[PDB]
């Protein structure tokens, strides 16, 4: 592999030569929702700390 | 006469454990700051056969509190734990199969596994396939916890000593007849060099207390004293009874 050009070692997506695309759909989706749902949890227990 | 077989064992030349294929030793997480004040989460990343062992291993990985990296651990898999599962470890962990908690934090009746004999010893009790320990009481002053080991023995250990919720995997392994010499062969081939077994009663006197005579026979009680000496201890050592066990066993 050290004899061969960089383009034999990647595909041009995020996590190119490393993870398998479908595995990266999963990563993006999962990231997003969890970062979203984190916003959710904060504001919910923010209300618990103000109404109790 | 000669040094008998069970004495030669100890110098471990041809008698050491066959080790090459083993996954590595099974061990709880080192008892750091996380696990004794809070909990820390891991993912079981792979559950995997370990040669010579009967119960599968769980490979479980955690973040490192003090450095940016993964640190991986080898657990023994409790039945029902699975890949991608989150494993919670610490004083303030919740009570589900797979998590690791200090016996102080679990109600009596709790069924645990791989428990420590002293806190921090990274697990010693009930590790073989199918085995577990039951918590049967607590004494909050001088924080001890009292458990019942698979042997029947009851024992009291520190309440900080840890264990993992559930039973070890691979139960009933021994329900199944080996059937042939060959299956034992491969069994011990991956363990140590203890198979097969010549009866001492089939050897000559040089070789064994049991050896010799014009018929095969032990010629003296085979219940040998505790205080016997190397070369002497063959047969029923320290035997406090002997003969077919009649009637129900089970520690009252």
């Amino acid at each position: 592999y050290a004899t061969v050009s960089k383009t034999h070692k990647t595909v041009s997506r995020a996590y190119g030569g490393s993870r398998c695309a479908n595995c990266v759909k999963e990563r993006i989706i999962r990231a997003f929702l969890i970062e979203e749902q984190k916003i959710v949890k904060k504001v919910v227990k923010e209300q618990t700390e103000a109404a109790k | 006469g000669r040094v008998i077989r069970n004495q030669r064992k100890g110098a471990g030349s041809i008698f050491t454990s066959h080790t090459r294929l083993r996954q590595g030793a099974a061990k709880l997480r080192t008892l750091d700051y996380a696990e004794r004040h809070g909990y820390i989460r891991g993912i079981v990343k792979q559950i995997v056969h370990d040669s010579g062992r009967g119960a599968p291993l769980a490979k479980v990985v955690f973040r490192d509190p003090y450095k940016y990296r993964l640190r991986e651990e080898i657990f023994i898999a409790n039945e029902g734990v699975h890949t991608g599962q989150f494993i919670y470890a610490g004083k303030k962990a919740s009570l589900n199969v797979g998590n690791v908690l200090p016996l102080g934090s679990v109600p009596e009746g709790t069924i645990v596994s791989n428990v420590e004999e002293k806190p921090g010893d990274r697990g010693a009790l009930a590790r073989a396939s199918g085995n577990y320990v039951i918590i049967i009481g607590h004494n909050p002053d001088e924080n001890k916890t009292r458990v019942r080991l698979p042997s029947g023995a009851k024992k009291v250990i520190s309440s900080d000593a840890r264990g993992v919720i559930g039973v070890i995997a691979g139960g009933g392994r021994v329900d199944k007849p080996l059937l042939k010499a060959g299956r034992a062969f491969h069994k011990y081939r991956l363990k140590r060099n203890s198979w097969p077994k010549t009866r001492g009663v089939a050897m000559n006197p040089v070789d064994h207390p049991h050896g010799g005579g014009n018929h095969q026979h032990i010629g003296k009680a085979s219940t040998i004293s505790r205080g016997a000496v190397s070369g002497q201890k063959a047969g029923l050592i320290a035997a406090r009874r002997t003969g077919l066990l009649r009637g129900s066993q089970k520690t009252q």
Binding site: - | Y33, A34, H37, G38, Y39, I40, R41, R63, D64, P65, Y66, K67, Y68
Partner: protein, 233 residues
């Protein structure tokens, strides 16, 4: 404020790598460090006998300064100074013809352990300083008693090294005045008085008091609280 953002980190277990802190309390020291610290510790956990222990009671810093201030006037010769004096002598003496007495009576602090001891034994010492370090303590533990008996005023003083400096040795172990200019006779009476009050007078009573028997602090508080709640409900 601008395109700059507040993003407080969360270092509370189970998230965010812990930051850098002072693990000073936790470093694994080289054994030699460990031993000289444990040597000090172990040395007060034990009940320590009255004839040791009577050290530890060192002179106080104000009186000391006053005692070093006096004792310093009397530094012994410097090599140059003595070279300077030998040509004062040998030349002028063996010529104009003085009796090795075109040289003044030297006044100096006396030192060297064996030297001071025969000085004390002979009642010639008039003020003696014993260092508090002296690791073979035996070299020096008999000295309060000595002085006490020979009616000699003495003081256990901080600094074997510092005794050293006022005599041009690296260390010195003991210092003593047998002599004194009249310009200084009186300022020493005061020093012998403060000192005799903090030591000689106190000696007979100090002889009864073992030292040590001190817990470490984790043990201390473990009892300052055990004993507090036990009784005072």
């Amino acid at each position: 404020n601008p395109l700059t953002h507040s993003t407080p980190k969360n270092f509370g277990i189970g998230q965010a790598v812990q930051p850098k802190r002072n693990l000073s309390r936790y470093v694994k020291w080289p054994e030699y460090v460990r031993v000289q610290r444990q040597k000090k510790i172990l040395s007060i956990r034990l009940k320590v006998p009255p004839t040791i222990a009577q050290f530890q009671y060192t002179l106080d810093r104000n009186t000391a300064a006053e005692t070093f201030k006096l004792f310093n006037k009397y530094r012994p010769e410097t090599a140059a100074e003595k070279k300077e004096r030998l040509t004062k002598e040998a030349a002028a003496v063996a010529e104009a013809k003085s009796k090795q007495d075109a040289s003044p009576k030297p006044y100096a602090v006396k030192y060297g352990l064996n030297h001071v001891v025969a000085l004390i034994e002979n009642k010639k010492a008039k003020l003696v300083l014993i260092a508090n370090d002296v690791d073979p303590i035996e070299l020096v533990v008999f000295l309060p008693a000595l002085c006490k008996k020979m009616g000699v005023p003495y003081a256990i003083v901080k600094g074997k090294a510092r005794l050293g400096t006022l005599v041009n040795q690296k260390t010195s172990a003991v210092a003593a005045l047998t002599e004194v200019r009249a310009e200084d006779e009186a300022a020493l009476a005061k020093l012998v008085s403060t000192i005799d009050a903090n030591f000689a007078d106190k000696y007979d009573e100090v002889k009864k008091h073992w030292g040590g028997g001190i817990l470490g602090n984790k043990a201390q508080a473990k009892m300052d609280k055990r004993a507090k709640n036990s009784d005072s409900a």
